[PDB]
Design a protein around this ligand. Structure first.
Ligand SMILES: [Zn+2]
Length: 259
């Protein structure tokens, strides 16, 4: 019952999921001058294996790559996290135009796209769903994307989009290392938040990396070729599939660096 259209978009989600107006909603506008430098935070480590990816799917809301999370081969640790969180999947948010698309913004600025690497506390909870209902259940690493030089590793992903252009379609996607989609810097902003799609559960520890990665305009354009609709229905391009900034509500945003 929810989407990114004019009748079912983010401004209307609260009608179905009241938590949409909660105190720990995401995304947010990150005001760099207001982030608190927290040196007490441990080093952020993204230990990813080369072949943990299972497939790529167009679920009607984004294009998602799912991982095998039976062990701790691909996990995030350090920074604000007390222990390791296993990678479940990653997906993206992008716009119809080149000046919008990201969910988080920095000092009012949006990027063309935003990548979310979704991890869960498999050590404490039995299922991803169970962890998604607990404050300390999930850890999402956000990476901003801008257009510039072509991204070599991104080609494998963008070349696979055609086969999953229609909603509900999926394809096998083996040996794709999400580490290849990370910037050289490990600086980040962290704050307690929520899923940015219904049920919008406030179970996410957000880790937004400071440095964006760049992909070519051609690559960005492939994402816009995806569709919100299925093969039969009329064609509606999957664009502007992002939730805009939500009220900070007195939350504290920490930074691993000094602006
Ligand atoms: Zn997301």
């Amino acid at each position: 019952g929810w989407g990114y259209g004019q009748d079912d978009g983010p401004s209307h989600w609260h009608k179905l999921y009241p938590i949409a107006q909660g105190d720990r909603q995401s995304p947010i506008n990150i005001i760099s001058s207001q982030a608190v430098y927290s040196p007490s935070l441990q080093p952020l480590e993204l230990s990813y294996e080369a072949c943990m990816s299972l497939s790529i799917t167009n679920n009607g809301h984004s294009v998602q790559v799912d991982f095998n999370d039976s062990d701790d081969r691909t996990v995030v640790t350090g920074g604000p996290l007390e222990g390791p969180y296993r990678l479940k999947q990653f997906h993206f948010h992008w716009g119809k135009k080149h000046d919008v698309g990201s969910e988080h913004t920095v000092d009012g600025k949006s990027f063309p796209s935003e990548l979310h690497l979704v991890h869960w506390n498999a050590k404490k909870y039995s299922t991803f769903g169970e962890a998604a209902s607990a404050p300390d259940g999930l850890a999402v690493v956000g990476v901003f994307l801008e257009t510039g030089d072509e991204h070599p590793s991104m080609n494998r992903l963008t070349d696979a989009l055609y086969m999953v252009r229609f909603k509900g379609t999926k394809a096998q996607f083996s040996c794709f290392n999400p580490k290849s989609l990370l910037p050289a810097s490990r600086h980040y902003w962290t704050y307690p938040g929520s899923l940015t799609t219904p049920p919008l559960s406030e179970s996410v520890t957000w880790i937004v990396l400071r440095e964006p990665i760049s992909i070519s305009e051609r690559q960005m354009g492939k994402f816009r070729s995806l569709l919100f609709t299925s093969e039969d229905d009329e064609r509606i391009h999957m664009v502007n599939n992002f939730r805009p900034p939500q009220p900070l509500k007195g939350r504290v945003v920490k930074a691993s660096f000094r602006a």
